[PDB]
Amino acid sequence: KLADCSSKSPEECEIFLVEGDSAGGSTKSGRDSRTQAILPLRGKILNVEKARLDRILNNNEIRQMITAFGTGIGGDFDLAKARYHKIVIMTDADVDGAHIRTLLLTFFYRFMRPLIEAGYVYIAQPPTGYKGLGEMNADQLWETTMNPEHRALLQVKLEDAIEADQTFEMLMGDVVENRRQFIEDNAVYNERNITSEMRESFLDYAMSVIVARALPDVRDGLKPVHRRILYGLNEQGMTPDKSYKKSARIVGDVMGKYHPHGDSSIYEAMVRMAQDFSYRYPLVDGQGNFGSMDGDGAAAMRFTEARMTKITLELLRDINKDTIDFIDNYDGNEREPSVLPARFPNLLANGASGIAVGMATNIPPHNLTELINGVLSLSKNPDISIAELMEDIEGPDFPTAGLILGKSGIRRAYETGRGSIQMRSRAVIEERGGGRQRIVVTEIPFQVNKARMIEKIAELVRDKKIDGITDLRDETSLRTGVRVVIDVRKDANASVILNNLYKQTPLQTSFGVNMIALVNGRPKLINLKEALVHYLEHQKTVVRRRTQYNLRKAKDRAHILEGLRIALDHIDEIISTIRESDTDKVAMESLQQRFKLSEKQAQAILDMRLRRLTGLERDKIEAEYNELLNYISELETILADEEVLLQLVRDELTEIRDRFGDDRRTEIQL
Amino acid sequence: GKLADCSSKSPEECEIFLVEGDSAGGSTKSGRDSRTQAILPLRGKILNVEKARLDRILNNNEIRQMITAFGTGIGGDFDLAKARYHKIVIMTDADVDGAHIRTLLLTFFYRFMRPLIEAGYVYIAQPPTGYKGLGEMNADQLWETTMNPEHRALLQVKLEDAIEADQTFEMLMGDVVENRRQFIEDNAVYANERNITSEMRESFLDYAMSVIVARALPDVRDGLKPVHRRILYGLNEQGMTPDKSYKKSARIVGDVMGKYHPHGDSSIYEAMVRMAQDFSYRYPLVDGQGNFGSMDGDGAAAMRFTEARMTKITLELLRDINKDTIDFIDNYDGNEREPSVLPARFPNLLANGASGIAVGMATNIPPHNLTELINGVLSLSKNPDISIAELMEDIEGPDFPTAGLILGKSGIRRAYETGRGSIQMRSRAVIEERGGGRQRIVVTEIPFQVNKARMIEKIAELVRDKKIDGITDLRDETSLRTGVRVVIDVRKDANASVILNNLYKQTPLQTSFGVNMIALVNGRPKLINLKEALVHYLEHQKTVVRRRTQYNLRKAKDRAHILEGLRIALDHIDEIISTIRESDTDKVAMESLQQRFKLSEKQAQAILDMRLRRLTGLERDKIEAEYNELLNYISELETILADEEVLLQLVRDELTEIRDRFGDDRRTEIQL
DNA sequence: AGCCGTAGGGCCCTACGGCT
DNA sequence: AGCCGTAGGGCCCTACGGC
Ligand SMILES: COc1ccc2nccc(CC[C@H]3OC[C@H](NC(=O)c4ccc5c(c4)NC(=O)CS5)CO3)c2c1
Ligand SMILES: [Mn+2]
């Protein structure tokens, strides 16, 4: 992968480390070939502070860096064999670039500290506002970043070896809690000291993953990638009524406008939203192969198509009625929603799982009928207890059904945001003839790979670690549903074998509830009541803002209609006024003065087509006006009375419950 | 392997379905009856065993997986009794590439597993059209249409006559191109049980004709293959003009794939990349931002990173496309329209060249200097009977983006007279001193289509292997500032001219361009000479300008007709308004206006659509002026259409303007 | 030879946290 | 252990004709 320089005198030679060949190509084209070598890596490198030594020494990118530098590692590290006197970290100007820099520095510090001490390690400073170096023309890269005469390299300086050791250990080591603490204490919502670099770069990454990747918002239940997909579907009018649209086109659009990351991240998030074994209320309606419970992936995105589900319309409902705040997209050329109106409680309905930095989230899905009944009960009683809420919300309700064992895990999770929930397959024992039996499994636990689970049983039977099983078959089909059959040896006890399978396979699995979501843009562990309270407050705001928007707009339109009504009442004078005017400007002025019109009204009259003078058109103007006056007084009633508003929220939730609410799938056994 | 086997183990009730890959295999696996139906995903095009030797065949992963899965062995050791399935079902995608994969599968079965065919174990599934591949189908649909024994319609493959079948496999799938070419020419039409010979002939012909007429060969008129046409049209439709900002490559590609070009991402993106590369295209058609590859064979950055738009000269390909100059057609699924051909206001086929490997034939057309080409067309426009030697007074020869040298005029002349000929390209190399009484060879230009890094590696190999004497060092000193610079140090006292001549003999420093000018002419492949290529280009331009003139005429007369209606309305506005006001509906008004004022329906409609702001004082004047200018314009257009020589002169003038704006110096030196 | 350029098709390494 | 899901990053097999 090394594209070496022609010179072999270390003192004038430089090596640039880039993320991959997309970046490597702009670099290779821009460089001075004589003195500047280029080593493309392959994205994120091994974190050597967490890895075993042998994994490190067998890692292909680690080996290539060692070979390139020529110095060996650790003990045998020989400075005078360095093939370059500048090693330049040139990752992309994005948060993942920052992460890759923290990773590279960790490796250098732990395995090549003398390289740092001798002042050989540098950080390049490519311009922001590019996704990667492959986005830059070679000449831009050269002039800004690589050319000795204009570039601003940062030389990496080690001051305090003690503070450095503690910094690498804290940020990059296996103990999460110290890293978590560092983030909470530091989170805000020429030479470079290596400790300062590691801390600022690592925090930059940590923060972005926490607030803008891996955790959902409490209000709409979405992570960024999901919000941008759904928003993208909305902007391209890909509603359930219209035909499916090619996935490649959806992804291309989302990536360009909103989500500056790899296609796999976008496509796979969309795919999960279309899987009825993953989403309790699927948000995407997929055409074609969208994967299976056996861990088959979707067909490639060139083959599939998609659109919104009907329930996703309720997530996006009234997004264009000034209900939620828009923000600039990543490059200032587009607007995107900060959050979706989310007219059902999607966070709890669909759940969320997310691996961040310093923390993670794991929120199970719920029955939408129960959830909405929960929100209605809270709406009538702000002081309701978790125990009273559990009269509506019994516990999780997984798309894959199955059993939950007991209530005490659910209770703890709802009270504290954390708890362990034991899940089991739906399995029965039945006769198969000749006095023989079988175990038949028709539902498996949430997030368990069915084919993996079966191979695990096949393995146990082969290693003779389970007695009694004479055959094992997946008889799943579209027509029959999930059906996994385990034949048992004649006169063996099938219940014992079943209990053994629960102990030794994912036929029984735990769900560790860890309910962290973004509240006011900050990560927080929340309980059931707080999730519902944040949801309800969001709904009040959305409906209130929609009411205010509809009021302003209706007033604007009535204002225009009053102008048109005046014009119809005095049409001969209107025509005369315009005919005697030389220009539009003069007409506009005369219309405003003669008939006491606003600029907006005069412009509307000037914009009126002659067809609007026919009988039916005159009547429509008046009908629309009288209808609007009514509408305006309805809107005003709502805004004058907080109880009327709250009731409106309840009636709208009730309508969604009646239309989309469905039966409980997962049985909570006592 | 990825064999997804069924549970039953009685051959006689078991079926195995062969599909193109995992995308298809996932729909198949979700839809199937897992008791009796195994699925084996392949990996796209399989080895053509009629062209490959045994070592290659038996080491091919997909071949091996099929041999293993069927259990019969192959060849002499074939045993029908060990078949693990009594139905082997070919279920490729319902497209031409699917048909190709079917012919490849049958060739394998026929040559290695003939008894399987003879025993009636081989079947062809018939999935429905309108899907890009099986992965586009829901599992229930795939089951009900294709796999369900209660409703499906398998074709059982029958071998009637083994001698005819032998001949068919050899002609269609074998190494002799000419008989395959003869087969296509004899059968092509341009613009249950299943006999295996009939299946092979029909499926292969489908594939071959589709590659010939709709993939691999350029149209003589605009010089474009379908993928490049769809990209450029796509850019135009989304208004990605040179004046607007760069658009992300990923969005262009997804857009083009969705609307026009139902093929892989990499086929589209790489075609776009090439059009943006100034070492590939003599006149680049795409303006790229970011890493778009190098002369060392580095690819472009992944499409997530790059951006693109049209170049200025591409606007000239698309000029007048919205003025009914070219026929639009339905796209592949009937939801869009696309151009059959671009107006192509410069002769793009010869300007940028073309290479393409089809079936039965290929094309290799070198690029040319646009100034020279246009002068050639002009000379032709004045003299239908102009000779090739005369044309060569304007068009000296190819002009490659990479410059360099062409040795002599013999190969050029043969290529322009016949459409075929070998042109010797040579690097630009000089001998120069390097100090200490030593010399070096310096190369600053290389032949078209030569990978610079690879040429350097070939030189290193000659040196390392003692196949060339006198080279002491070898470096690529190329840079953005320097341009291409490859240096070969020569040993003190060695003759550098002799070393250079040896390099020309033994390395890509000198390379042949084999001209083979095949293009689509009236939608069929034709070997054409220079004059024929220019003639068709000139005819296309006459048609474009005539049609544009006709279009403008129609639009002018329509506008004049509306303006006559507006004049009347403004001259009688009070009666107009009163007519409309007493009318209850649109229809009534339209009728009363028409009867009272001798208005057409279009006139009455335009009046009803008139805004009140059009009644201001200077409007009757603006309408009178426009009408007077229009009348003038109309008669100017009528002149053009009544006089062939006027039309042709208008063609000449537009070409000349393009030459003056875009024509550039020759790069490639032709040495005599 | 293997390369030129439109086509068919797919797989594997890395970080991150918490649960087993 | 190693899986879950958003993220960083990339490579190799095939057909086809001509030289
Ligand atoms: C790169 O280095 C390696 C390494 C070896 C590999 N081994 C196996 C498979 C692969 C990649 C194959 C995989 O197939 C699906 C493919 N994309 C599409 O179908 C597609 C279509 C259209 C678009 C699109 C994507 N993306 C957009 O932004 C919108 S337009 C994405 O990549 C390998 C790649
Ligand atoms: Mn990057």
Ligand SMILES: [Mn+2]
């Ligand atoms: Mn296919």
